[PDB]
Amino acid sequence: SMHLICQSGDVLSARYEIVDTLGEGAFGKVVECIDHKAGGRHVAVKIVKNVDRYCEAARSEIQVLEHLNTTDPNSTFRCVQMLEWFEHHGHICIVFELLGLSTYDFIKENGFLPFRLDHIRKMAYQICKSVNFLHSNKLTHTDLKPENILFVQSDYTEAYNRDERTLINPDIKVVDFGSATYDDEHHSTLVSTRHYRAPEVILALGWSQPCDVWSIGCILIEYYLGFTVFPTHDSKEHLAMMERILGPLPKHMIQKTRKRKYFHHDRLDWDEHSSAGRYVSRACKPLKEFMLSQDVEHERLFDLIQKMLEYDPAKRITLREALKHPFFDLLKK
Numbered sequence: 022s023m024h025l026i027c028q029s030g031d032v033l034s035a036r037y038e039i040v041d042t043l044g045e046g047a048f049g050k051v052v053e054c055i056d057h058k059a060g061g062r063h064v065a066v067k068i069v070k071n072v073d074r075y076c077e078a079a080r081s082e083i084q085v086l087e088h089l090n091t092t093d094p095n096s097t098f099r100c101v102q103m104l105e106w107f108e109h110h111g112h113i114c115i116v117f118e119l120l121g122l123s124t125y126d127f128i129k130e131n132g133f134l135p136f137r138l139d140h141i142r143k144m145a146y147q148i149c150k151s152v153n154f155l156h157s158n159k160l161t162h163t164d165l166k167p168e169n170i171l172f173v174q175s176d177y178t179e180a181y182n183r184d185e186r187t188l189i190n191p192d193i194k195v196v197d198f199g200s201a202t203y204d205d206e207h208h209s210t211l212v213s214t215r216h217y218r219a220p221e222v223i224l225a226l227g228w229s230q231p232c233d234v235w236s237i238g239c240i241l242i243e244y245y246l247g248f249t250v251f252p253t254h255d256s257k258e259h260l261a262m263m264e265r266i267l268g269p270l271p272k273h274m275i276q277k278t279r280k281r282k283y284f285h286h287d288r289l290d291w292d293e294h295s296s297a298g299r300y301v302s303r304a305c306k307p308l309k310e311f312m313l314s315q316d317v318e319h320e321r322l323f324d325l326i327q328k329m330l331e332y333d334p335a336k337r338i339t340l341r342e343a344l345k346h347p348f349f350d351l352l353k354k
């Protein structure tokens with residue numbers, strides 16, 4: 022098992038000495054190592070489960086990273102830099118530049134308090150620019166979520182408001198290219214982590230780059246509030262939540278979908294008065310009611326979020342367009 026080969030002091034590839042665990046995911050774990058053959062540089066090594074689906078994803082991730090890193094050698098577009106890969110007791114191991122905490126882990130260690138708006142703006146711009154670079158290279162990420170956006174450096178100051186932690190420097194990088202898909206490749210029927218999953222994915226209408234834009238809109242709401250507006254583990258409940266927050270689904274999408282299981286005639290097959298129904302009614306409300314302030318900068322953020330959460334993936338704002346939105350005009354002064 023992986024536990025046997027991922028401990029502090031273990032040495033990988035006769036080169037990388039484990040000093041700490043950074044994180045764990047479905048794929049395996051990421052450890053911090055000292056690289057004895059690169060002057061003692063600390064690096065991150067992703068140790069992948071010796072399990073078919075995760076091995077395949079790792080091999081695909083390596084191919085994507087080779088492409089992206091050769092295309093953008095200066096990391097101008099802020100995708101994580103892969104250094105090399107190797108195999109260790111049957112596990113694929115991928116070596117990366119060492120980053121700070123994921124945006125998820127930062128929020129968690131901050132008592133699930135949200136980020137300040139000025140930080141959200143800077144983070145959103147960088148996320149959009151980075152994912153737009155993928156989109157320009159015929160790729161879709163498919164698994165954008167706060168766990169896959171990492172701070173370059175996660176030092177903070179703390180002060181009483183709740184005691185809150187505030188980032189010194191909110192610069193990010195995008196990680197995890199194990200699900201990333203090229204335009205001409207097979208598209209998995211299911212993609213994304215549930216809370217960040219686009220309606221065209223749920224309804225099996227076909228997906229491409231716009232599903233990343235949806236995920237980004239969900240991420241920005243979580244950064245703003247400290248929690249998801251879609252607190253569910255069920256697809257039909259997820260659609261019910263979308264309806265309460267964003268309004269009814271477009272007729273044409275309901276007309277076209279093979280996912281007839283979710284619908285009674287032309288409307289969601291949903292009992293407002295069941296346990297799940299009562300929960301959705303309590304937990305969900307129109308998007309703009311989640312605003313914490315009516316100051317114009319909040320209005321600018323919510324205008325962008327609403328465009329990112331457009332149901333129709335063709336109408337949905339692209340990242341190239343998002344980068345020109347008024348919310349970002351403050352960064353361009």
Ligand SMILES: NC1=N/C(=C2/CCNC(=O)c3[nH]ccc32)C(=O)N1
Nearest residue numbers: 043044051065117118119120196197
């Ligand atoms: N999910 C995912 N996380 C990755 C890395 C590798 C990139 N660098 C890191 O420091 C790191 N810290 C915590 C996790 C990571 C990664 O490559 N995929």
